[PDB]
Design a protein around this nucleic acid. Structure first.
Length: 128
DNA sequence: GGAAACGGTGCTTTCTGGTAGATATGGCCGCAACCGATAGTTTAACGGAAACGCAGGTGATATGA
């Protein structure tokens, strides 16, 4: 009922009311992905990117099946210097589907920045 | 009323040999240090156990499909 009312308010562009209703559920469960599927949109549009990335990452630990999205979670985590989290997100991208080859390259930049090259080398051989 | 002549031996002196510490040089023995190597975390990421959810052996109530 709360999730329907919050998503209805989101469709009405009543984003603060939508947030207040999603917060009634998030207060009971901080990992409630069913709220973040649209509350994350509110947080991204309002520039709350620090809270937005965490809303994706902590809930997606459980809700990992939207696998293409882990690339976006990894990218934003790296832009915010949450580098462990960025590598952990790219791991799920590659573990769920290796064919997202640009993700191997992007992850290899994190490896280049910190000297973690032994993980990049076999990956670049596969890319080549 | 005393000083000058010089015999007594007490007290002292170098020539030396003794006592015996000292060390330039020497040869063992083993401490100070380095590059070396074995063992250490904890996690990439997915191989594993324990943890996890739906079936099938009956029955069969409704009224729609």
């Amino acid at each position: 009922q709360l999730l329907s009312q919050a998503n209805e308010a989101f469709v009405r562009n009543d984003l603060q009311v939508a947030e207040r209703l999603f917060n009634e559920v998030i207060k009971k469960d901080a990992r409630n992905f069913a709220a973040y599927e649209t509350l994350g949109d509110i947080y991204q549009l309002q520039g709350r990117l620090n809270d937005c990335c965490n809303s994706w990452f902590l809930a997606a630990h459980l809700n990992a099946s939207d696998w293409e999205f882990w690339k976006i979670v990894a990218i934003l985590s790296a832009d915010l210097d949450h580098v462990r989290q960025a590598i952990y997100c790219f791991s799920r991208v590659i573990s769920l589907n290796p064919m997202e080859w640009e993700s191997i390259y992007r992850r290899s930049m994190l490896y280049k920045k910190t000297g973690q090259l032994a993980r990049a080398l076999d990956g670049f051989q596969r890319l080549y």
